[PDB]
A paper describes a structure:
The TINCR (Terminal differentiation-Induced Non-Coding RNA) gene is selectively expressed in epithelium tissues and is involved in the control of human epidermal differentiation and wound healing.
To best evaluate the impact of these alterations we analysed the structure of the TINCR protein. However, its high B-factor values suggest that it is highly mobile in solution. However, unlike most ubiquitin-like factors, the TINCR protein lacks a characteristic C-terminal di-glycine motif7 (valine glycine motif in UFM1) required for protein conjugation. The absence of this sequence in TINCR points to a specific role and suggests that this ubiquitin-like factor may not function as a substrate for lysine protein conjugation. Similarly, the introduction of a compound p.V18M, p.V49M mutation resulted in almost complete abrogation of TINCR protein expression.
Numbering used by the authors:
A (entry chain A): 2 to 86
B (entry chain B): 12 to 86
Write the structure that this text describes.
Amino acid sequence: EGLRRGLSRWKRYHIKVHLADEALLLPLTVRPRDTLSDLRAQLVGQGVSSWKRAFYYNARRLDDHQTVRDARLQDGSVLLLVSDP
Amino acid sequence: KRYHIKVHLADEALLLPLTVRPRDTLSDLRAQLVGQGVSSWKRAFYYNARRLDDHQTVRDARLQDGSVLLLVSDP
Ligand SMILES: [Cl-]
């Protein structure tokens, strides 16, 4: 049932957010429960100007309330953070 | 002199290292990606989210060691 996922409560993904505008790769440690909003909040804590920027994975736009699990991210996954004028 | 850059293939979500010379054109980088099986037809390079011209050199695009380019498929 949920035994497997139960025994992995402390699972952390080490991912990368490619900030397109800065051509920078920011590493984030994230939980599969985290929403992209949590990721945005982490990035804001690093001074990333998040206003009017969206996440893309496999070149498709992600809704801010998807989770790291729903986005099917894993260790090493690279997200793209894209400005919209 | 060689730079070690990365190309972020947006569709595949992969980060491909390339070794390039400052005088390499982006057309040369494309041929490297094609040699690695990257389906490059109608994909363009972006840096700082500005579309790049294939005739531009690594040097003139102001790339350096560790620069991350972005390869994006066209409309
Ligand atoms: Cl040459």
